[PDB]
Amino acid sequence: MLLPVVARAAVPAIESAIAATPGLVSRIAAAIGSKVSPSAILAAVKSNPVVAGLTLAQIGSTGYDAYQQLLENHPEVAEMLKDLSFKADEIQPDFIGNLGQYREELELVEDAARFVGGMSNLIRLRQALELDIKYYGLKMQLNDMGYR
Amino acid sequence: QYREELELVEDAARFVGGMSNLIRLRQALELDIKYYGLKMQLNDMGYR
Amino acid sequence: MLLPVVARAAVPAIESAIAATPGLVSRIAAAIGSKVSPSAILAAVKSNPVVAGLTLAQIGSTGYDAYQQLLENHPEVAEMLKDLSFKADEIQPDFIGNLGQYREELELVEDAARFVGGMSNLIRLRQALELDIKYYGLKMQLNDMGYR
Amino acid sequence: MLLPVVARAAVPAIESAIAATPGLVSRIAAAIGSKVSPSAILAAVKSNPVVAGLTLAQIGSTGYDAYQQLLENHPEVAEMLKDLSFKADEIQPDFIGNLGQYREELELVEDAARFVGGMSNLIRLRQALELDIKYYGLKMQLNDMGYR
Amino acid sequence: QYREELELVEDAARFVGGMSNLIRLRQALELDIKYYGLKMQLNDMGYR
Amino acid sequence: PTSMKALDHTSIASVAPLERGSVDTDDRNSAPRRGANFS
Amino acid sequence: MFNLKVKDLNGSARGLTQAFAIGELKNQLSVGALQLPLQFTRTFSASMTSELLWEVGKGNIDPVMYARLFFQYAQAGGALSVDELVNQFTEYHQSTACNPEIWRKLTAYITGSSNRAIKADAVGKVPPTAILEQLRTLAPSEHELFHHITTDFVCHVLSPLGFILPDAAYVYRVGRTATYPNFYALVDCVRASDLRRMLTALSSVDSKMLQATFKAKGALAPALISQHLANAATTAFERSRGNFDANAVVSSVLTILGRLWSPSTPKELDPSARLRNTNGIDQLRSNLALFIAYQDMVKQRGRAEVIFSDEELSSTIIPWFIEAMSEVSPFKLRPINETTSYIGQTSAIDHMGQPSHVVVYEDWQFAKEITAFTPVKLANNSNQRFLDVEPGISDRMSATLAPIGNTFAVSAFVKNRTAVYEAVSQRGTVNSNGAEMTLGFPSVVERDYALDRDPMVAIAALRTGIVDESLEARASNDLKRSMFNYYAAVMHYAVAHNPEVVVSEHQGVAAEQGSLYLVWNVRTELRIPVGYNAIEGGSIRTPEPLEAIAYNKPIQPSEVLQAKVLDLANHTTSIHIWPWHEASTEFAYEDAYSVTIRNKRYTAEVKEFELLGLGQRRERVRILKPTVAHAIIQMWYSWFVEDDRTLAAARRTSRDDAEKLAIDGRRMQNAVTLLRKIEMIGTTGIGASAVHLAQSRIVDQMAGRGLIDDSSDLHVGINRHRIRIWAGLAVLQMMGLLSRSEAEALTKVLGDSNALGMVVATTDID
């Protein structure tokens, strides 16, 4: 079924999207595999959380809000939701070879990293050196005044 | 008519694991080849 | 790192193929998945042996020599390289049924084999019988003289 | 100094490049920081292996052969030489973010990998399924004939 | 004139390590910033 | 020379682990972890 | 370290609150409105043990433990439940035993003889793994764990005759047990009573007769074996047949308890005068572990139904349900006082009475042993690999770690904490908030290291109550199962020290038809409430098990909690099939001791293989993780920086002379006890050899420059006290015990307090 807390907020979000354009109604009917009639899918949403999620993936404009709040309502649908909704990310032809050239380079950073400390430190230390000279003077002067 | 068919899935399911796994594994194979190359290369750089 | 002993031969071999025709440069860039620029792939070859192999599969004309020499100094890649480079051999529609008829026949050979000895023997013995008759006479005559 | 086995090949290789074009002579004089005269740098090459390497980086056309052979007989310079000669690989603006999308995807492969076995296996198993059906028939038939 | 100068390097050398290291470390800093971002991101994906 | 070839091709009796995992770790080398600075 | 604000419990820790357990996510939970009196005198606690490697290959069957393997294979294995498993086992057992052929075909293989008797001398030997290979083809299954159980059955009847090779061996790891039953852990342990009656039939077949008739006559056909097996395997098939659904044994018998606890049960459905008087309900009525199980039951199902006949049938269920649990199992009933024995409490009191901070901690016996193995593959691309324990690496560390052990015991951490809150607090009441409650649970952080998980999702599981989905199911299944232990382990504690408990029934939001929650009667003798309740009558009635803790007086833990290491040493030959790369840490280290002598910098690098006596760097070996050791030290670190932070926070705002000097009195006194402790680690076997070397890399680096020698009257001592300290971190750094970041901050704390400056100040006379 469907928990009521999800329902007070969730039901109108979908209904709004339907009223916005009919073109989505046919889409969700195809993806969820439900009767094309707007009353049908709305009956399905209430019934299963997994179904409710796939609908909110089909409409991301107004619907993104409830979807996130649905994550909190049901742990299980979201867990089995991440799999059912998936798209292969188009990979660039150049990419994997283009990465091959950085092999030499990254191994250089990690030699510098280990020496300094965590990567966070090295990012700091890099700035300290790049930093303007006057500052080294400034800090020296505060120590001259006996402040440290 | 689907009697023949569903019994086929559940033979594949039990082997792999929960139905959730098989849905994943199915995608892994359907997935583009380059990715297998990509992952191999990160292991070449010594990243696990 | 690619071993020098290989790399010495490998690099100019590839570079030669590139200079021969541009059409290969685009191909290897696709297969290895590297930047189309000839300088890029040449930077990749040096970096990884696995990559070096796939390139030499793409060009077999001039390149076959180095490839084998790569295979020698690197038994490691040999397994991995064999997998990444593969093509399903087109099977003839008639083949598997055409093989079904020889079931009766091969079982006949193996009955003859076991009797004689190893298959090597039977191939010999078959020739001995097929052999011309005079030879049997010849051998008999050397024994007539005393020769064994 | 420089080992003869290398030097034998090294010296004429450099000298050849010099005789090819003067434009390189000025370049190497700048990089190595040696007197511009062709006789000077040739005196330096013999003296230090580290210097000999940087020269062979400046000319890669004819020189790549000796360089590798230099690298063999001198594993010592190999570390030092690798550092002195370096160029930051130009990174594409899109790259790091473009990689961010594959986070979801690679974690999917490694779930499939662990199950099957080493990555090498999964690449095989993937082919086995993608493989044409007839082959499954073929193998079944050889077992029908009692072959294993 | 370089007396003053070389003694400066060898102060930096000893700190870091062998001269080979310092030549590396010098490059690491001179290196473009994006790379620091790149490496951070691979660690974000759980590679090491 | 004696031939150990035939004896070389073998299979090991297979078995399945209860909890799958730790598979790709067969061959890897993690390079050492440094200590902290000292003062 | 986990901090909660006891005043608002809902927000800070929802995991341990009761409002969550019975299904209130919203803030509201009923007051002491309606009530019924009760006393819980017993509980079901798991026996005290942790995982051990047990080997399945040999001919014995030990029914208790194979049962335990099913728990792990099905439950933590990612599969649905052990219930569905066991059912698919008895469909499998019916397949072979009731089938006449399958016992012939594999006795044709093991005896070799199809149609004729076998003499007494001509008896070959067939290795156990063999017959398994074929049984795979005969009676195929998707669970290998079944084939092992049948395989070593036939091995047991054939062992006396000697048809099989003894030598082969093989091994798995049984899992850890939750100390208190989750609802399903009841259902499981009931099915596992069936199973244990299954196996006890297989296990007990002697076949002595088949051994006697073989000796005298001299020979026997396979017709004697292949029957005598088939008689055994169908004795077991009897004993499986006709047992009750565990799911409906428990579901009912937790309901008909739940109706005789709750005061408000409608008379329309009232457990009848007979079953209330049933033998055994008396006892099960007063049992706690069931209650918190019941609360779970209704949390999930939301409801309950009694299918079994409300009278005649349900009075043969109970005596069957009791015999399941009561019999030796992982769960064995104990007097309630004992199961919480290790928890302990201490508080920081105001002048009036009430808590400012109050700490709850799990005592520990620090584990002083460590082992190091080298993994060995059987063949390329085969996962069978079996490790070799290497002594002489391990003898070093366990003689290194043994000195660490004595000085970190947990009680000395809180004994230290309360010494902080004495000094930092002002003189004035705490009305401003309920007293915050800090609770050390080294067991939490411990389980994160062996499972390799971010400590931040573990804590944030207790805080909000929901488990993150981003993680893979193998963790969540051990995370929630964990998060339930702490919940339970809390209420056993609260109840143990407040014997007066009262059972209400929640119906404010009408979430479920049946619900239950305790409310404690604790007598506070305090003026103002901590948490929020009216504190009326000189006793407060608080639904939350946490609040009811806060009003306790100090408690000293009477029993040390015991970690124990996994044991590789015993079985060396057996091939490990369980993944061992989860429990293994790579072992490698590098560090540089830098000192400045007469205006220069001298750095001594050092490597771990040198420290251990090894001459060469060997890559393979992997230290088996020292979790509980890394758990404690992790705690002691976070409480140290926490202390030293809270002081220097007050030290700024102190605005008193008398008090301000008491803070710096504390910090210094703290930091130089810190240091005398690390210096104590420096004298250890690794500490020694780290020092001896570090001085020696520094000497030969000064060879070139002649410079004058030291007094060493105190200089040898001053230099010495410093080099040891750096050993102290090096040993901690190289083993897992201290992460590199926190090692730096721990230098910085010891750095600015100028601890070393004050340590030497005791070695001079003026």
PDB file of N, CA, C and O in Angstrom, chain G residues 479-514:
ATOM      1  N   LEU G 479      24.344  -3.802  10.394  1.00  0.00           N
ATOM      2  CA  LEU G 479      24.168  -2.524  11.077  1.00  0.00           C
ATOM      3  C   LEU G 479      22.903  -2.475  11.908  1.00  0.00           C
ATOM      4  O   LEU G 479      22.943  -2.130  13.081  1.00  0.00           O
ATOM      5  N   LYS G 480      21.784  -2.845  11.305  1.00  0.00           N
ATOM      6  CA  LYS G 480      20.520  -2.819  12.024  1.00  0.00           C
ATOM      7  C   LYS G 480      20.535  -3.864  13.110  1.00  0.00           C
ATOM      8  O   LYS G 480      20.104  -3.615  14.228  1.00  0.00           O
ATOM      9  N   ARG G 481      21.047  -5.038  12.777  1.00  0.00           N
ATOM     10  CA  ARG G 481      21.146  -6.111  13.743  1.00  0.00           C
ATOM     11  C   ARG G 481      22.007  -5.657  14.902  1.00  0.00           C
ATOM     12  O   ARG G 481      21.812  -6.082  16.027  1.00  0.00           O
ATOM     13  N   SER G 482      22.973  -4.795  14.620  1.00  0.00           N
ATOM     14  CA  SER G 482      23.760  -4.206  15.686  1.00  0.00           C
ATOM     15  C   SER G 482      22.941  -3.192  16.448  1.00  0.00           C
ATOM     16  O   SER G 482      22.813  -3.278  17.664  1.00  0.00           O
ATOM     17  N   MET G 483      22.364  -2.242  15.724  1.00  0.00           N
ATOM     18  CA  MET G 483      21.637  -1.137  16.337  1.00  0.00           C
ATOM     19  C   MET G 483      20.514  -1.647  17.223  1.00  0.00           C
ATOM     20  O   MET G 483      20.060  -0.953  18.120  1.00  0.00           O
ATOM     21  N   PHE G 484      20.069  -2.868  16.981  1.00  0.00           N
ATOM     22  CA  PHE G 484      19.087  -3.462  17.862  1.00  0.00           C
ATOM     23  C   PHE G 484      19.732  -3.985  19.127  1.00  0.00           C
ATOM     24  O   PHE G 484      19.088  -4.018  20.161  1.00  0.00           O
ATOM     25  N   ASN G 485      20.983  -4.422  19.065  1.00  0.00           N
ATOM     26  CA  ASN G 485      21.613  -4.905  20.282  1.00  0.00           C
ATOM     27  C   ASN G 485      21.687  -3.805  21.299  1.00  0.00           C
ATOM     28  O   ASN G 485      21.361  -4.011  22.460  1.00  0.00           O
ATOM     29  N   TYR G 486      22.108  -2.627  20.866  1.00  0.00           N
ATOM     30  CA  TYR G 486      22.295  -1.535  21.799  1.00  0.00           C
ATOM     31  C   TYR G 486      20.980  -1.135  22.396  1.00  0.00           C
ATOM     32  O   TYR G 486      20.904  -0.870  23.586  1.00  0.00           O
ATOM     33  N   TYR G 487      19.937  -1.119  21.583  1.00  0.00           N
ATOM     34  CA  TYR G 487      18.625  -0.839  22.116  1.00  0.00           C
ATOM     35  C   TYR G 487      18.294  -1.809  23.216  1.00  0.00           C
ATOM     36  O   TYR G 487      17.958  -1.411  24.313  1.00  0.00           O
ATOM     37  N   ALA G 488      18.390  -3.088  22.914  1.00  0.00           N
ATOM     38  CA  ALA G 488      18.112  -4.105  23.904  1.00  0.00           C
ATOM     39  C   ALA G 488      19.025  -3.952  25.095  1.00  0.00           C
ATOM     40  O   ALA G 488      18.564  -3.901  26.225  1.00  0.00           O
ATOM     41  N   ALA G 489      20.321  -3.859  24.832  1.00  0.00           N
ATOM     42  CA  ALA G 489      21.318  -3.826  25.894  1.00  0.00           C
ATOM     43  C   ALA G 489      21.087  -2.659  26.832  1.00  0.00           C
ATOM     44  O   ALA G 489      21.455  -2.717  27.996  1.00  0.00           O
ATOM     45  N   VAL G 490      20.484  -1.597  26.319  1.00  0.00           N
ATOM     46  CA  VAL G 490      20.052  -0.500  27.167  1.00  0.00           C
ATOM     47  C   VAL G 490      18.962  -0.935  28.118  1.00  0.00           C
ATOM     48  O   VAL G 490      19.105  -0.782  29.325  1.00  0.00           O
ATOM     49  N   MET G 491      17.874  -1.488  27.598  1.00  0.00           N
ATOM     50  CA  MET G 491      16.744  -1.779  28.460  1.00  0.00           C
ATOM     51  C   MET G 491      17.024  -2.880  29.454  1.00  0.00           C
ATOM     52  O   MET G 491      16.501  -2.826  30.554  1.00  0.00           O
ATOM     53  N   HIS G 492      17.843  -3.865  29.116  1.00  0.00           N
ATOM     54  CA  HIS G 492      18.234  -4.814  30.149  1.00  0.00           C
ATOM     55  C   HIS G 492      18.945  -4.090  31.269  1.00  0.00           C
ATOM     56  O   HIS G 492      18.822  -4.462  32.426  1.00  0.00           O
ATOM     57  N   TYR G 493      19.695  -3.054  30.934  1.00  0.00           N
ATOM     58  CA  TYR G 493      20.406  -2.325  31.970  1.00  0.00           C
ATOM     59  C   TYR G 493      19.448  -1.554  32.841  1.00  0.00           C
ATOM     60  O   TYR G 493      19.473  -1.692  34.058  1.00  0.00           O
ATOM     61  N   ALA G 494      18.591  -0.758  32.219  1.00  0.00           N
ATOM     62  CA  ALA G 494      17.684   0.086  32.967  1.00  0.00           C
ATOM     63  C   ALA G 494      16.843  -0.757  33.894  1.00  0.00           C
ATOM     64  O   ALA G 494      16.697  -0.435  35.059  1.00  0.00           O
ATOM     65  N   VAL G 495      16.318  -1.857  33.380  1.00  0.00           N
ATOM     66  CA  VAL G 495      15.446  -2.721  34.164  1.00  0.00           C
ATOM     67  C   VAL G 495      16.190  -3.392  35.301  1.00  0.00           C
ATOM     68  O   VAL G 495      15.644  -3.561  36.383  1.00  0.00           O
ATOM     69  N   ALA G 496      17.438  -3.759  35.069  1.00  0.00           N
ATOM     70  CA  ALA G 496      18.195  -4.463  36.087  1.00  0.00           C
ATOM     71  C   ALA G 496      18.315  -3.646  37.354  1.00  0.00           C
ATOM     72  O   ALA G 496      18.277  -4.196  38.446  1.00  0.00           O
ATOM     73  N   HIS G 497      18.485  -2.340  37.208  1.00  0.00           N
ATOM     74  CA  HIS G 497      18.654  -1.451  38.354  1.00  0.00           C
ATOM     75  C   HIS G 497      17.402  -0.687  38.792  1.00  0.00           C
ATOM     76  O   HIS G 497      17.459   0.118  39.714  1.00  0.00           O
ATOM     77  N   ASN G 498      16.278  -0.924  38.125  1.00  0.00           N
ATOM     78  CA  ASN G 498      14.993  -0.431  38.601  1.00  0.00           C
ATOM     79  C   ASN G 498      13.960  -1.511  38.493  1.00  0.00           C
ATOM     80  O   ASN G 498      13.127  -1.472  37.599  1.00  0.00           O
ATOM     81  N   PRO G 499      13.990  -2.468  39.415  1.00  0.00           N
ATOM     82  CA  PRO G 499      13.135  -3.653  39.367  1.00  0.00           C
ATOM     83  C   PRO G 499      11.660  -3.336  39.216  1.00  0.00           C
ATOM     84  O   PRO G 499      10.905  -4.205  38.797  1.00  0.00           O
ATOM     85  N   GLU G 500      11.248  -2.113  39.531  1.00  0.00           N
ATOM     86  CA  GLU G 500       9.846  -1.741  39.384  1.00  0.00           C
ATOM     87  C   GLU G 500       9.592  -1.235  37.981  1.00  0.00           C
ATOM     88  O   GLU G 500      10.076  -0.181  37.600  1.00  0.00           O
ATOM     89  N   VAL G 501       8.820  -1.982  37.215  1.00  0.00           N
ATOM     90  CA  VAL G 501       8.495  -1.567  35.870  1.00  0.00           C
ATOM     91  C   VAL G 501       7.029  -1.785  35.650  1.00  0.00           C
ATOM     92  O   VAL G 501       6.422  -2.643  36.271  1.00  0.00           O
ATOM     93  N   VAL G 502       6.447  -1.004  34.762  1.00  0.00           N
ATOM     94  CA  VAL G 502       5.015  -0.995  34.629  1.00  0.00           C
ATOM     95  C   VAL G 502       4.638  -0.919  33.177  1.00  0.00           C
ATOM     96  O   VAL G 502       5.162  -0.085  32.461  1.00  0.00           O
ATOM     97  N   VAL G 503       3.717  -1.769  32.737  1.00  0.00           N
ATOM     98  CA  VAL G 503       3.433  -1.905  31.319  1.00  0.00           C
ATOM     99  C   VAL G 503       2.201  -1.170  30.884  1.00  0.00           C
ATOM    100  O   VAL G 503       1.112  -1.519  31.283  1.00  0.00           O
ATOM    101  N   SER G 504       2.349  -0.173  30.041  1.00  0.00           N
ATOM    102  CA  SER G 504       1.191   0.560  29.582  1.00  0.00           C
ATOM    103  C   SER G 504       0.726   0.038  28.251  1.00  0.00           C
ATOM    104  O   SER G 504       1.190  -0.992  27.802  1.00  0.00           O
ATOM    105  N   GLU G 505      -0.222   0.725  27.633  1.00  0.00           N
ATOM    106  CA  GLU G 505      -0.540   0.447  26.246  1.00  0.00           C
ATOM    107  C   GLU G 505      -0.763   1.709  25.425  1.00  0.00           C
ATOM    108  O   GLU G 505      -1.695   2.458  25.671  1.00  0.00           O
ATOM    109  N   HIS G 506       0.082   1.912  24.419  1.00  0.00           N
ATOM    110  CA  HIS G 506       0.041   3.105  23.584  1.00  0.00           C
ATOM    111  C   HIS G 506      -1.053   3.016  22.540  1.00  0.00           C
ATOM    112  O   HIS G 506      -1.279   1.959  21.966  1.00  0.00           O
ATOM    113  N   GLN G 507      -1.890   4.047  22.506  1.00  0.00           N
ATOM    114  CA  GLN G 507      -2.986   4.126  21.547  1.00  0.00           C
ATOM    115  C   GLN G 507      -3.306   5.560  21.135  1.00  0.00           C
ATOM    116  O   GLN G 507      -4.371   5.817  20.576  1.00  0.00           O
ATOM    117  N   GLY G 508      -2.400   6.494  21.401  1.00  0.00           N
ATOM    118  CA  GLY G 508      -2.677   7.884  21.087  1.00  0.00           C
ATOM    119  C   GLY G 508      -2.902   8.168  19.617  1.00  0.00           C
ATOM    120  O   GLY G 508      -3.829   8.892  19.256  1.00  0.00           O
ATOM    121  N   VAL G 509      -2.060   7.602  18.762  1.00  0.00           N
ATOM    122  CA  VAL G 509      -2.221   7.790  17.325  1.00  0.00           C
ATOM    123  C   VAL G 509      -2.896   6.576  16.691  1.00  0.00           C
ATOM    124  O   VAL G 509      -3.120   6.546  15.479  1.00  0.00           O
ATOM    125  N   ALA G 510      -3.183   5.569  17.516  1.00  0.00           N
ATOM    126  CA  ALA G 510      -3.831   4.326  17.087  1.00  0.00           C
ATOM    127  C   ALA G 510      -3.100   3.638  15.934  1.00  0.00           C
ATOM    128  O   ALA G 510      -3.730   3.142  15.002  1.00  0.00           O
ATOM    129  N   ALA G 511      -1.771   3.612  16.001  1.00  0.00           N
ATOM    130  CA  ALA G 511      -0.961   2.997  14.955  1.00  0.00           C
ATOM    131  C   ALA G 511      -1.205   1.496  14.817  1.00  0.00           C
ATOM    132  O   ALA G 511      -1.283   0.971  13.706  1.00  0.00           O
ATOM    133  N   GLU G 512      -1.323   0.806  15.946  1.00  0.00           N
ATOM    134  CA  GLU G 512      -1.551  -0.633  15.935  1.00  0.00           C
ATOM    135  C   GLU G 512      -2.598  -1.049  16.959  1.00  0.00           C
ATOM    136  O   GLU G 512      -2.804  -0.367  17.961  1.00  0.00           O
ATOM    137  N   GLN G 513      -3.263  -2.168  16.697  1.00  0.00           N
ATOM    138  CA  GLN G 513      -4.283  -2.672  17.604  1.00  0.00           C
ATOM    139  C   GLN G 513      -3.667  -3.024  18.953  1.00  0.00           C
ATOM    140  O   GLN G 513      -4.243  -2.739  20.002  1.00  0.00           O
ATOM    141  N   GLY G 514      -2.491  -3.641  18.915  1.00  0.00           N
ATOM    142  CA  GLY G 514      -1.793  -4.023  20.129  1.00  0.00           C
ATOM    143  C   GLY G 514      -0.416  -3.399  20.218  1.00  0.00           C
ATOM    144  O   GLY G 514       0.363  -3.461  19.269  1.00  0.00           O
TER     145      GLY G 514
END
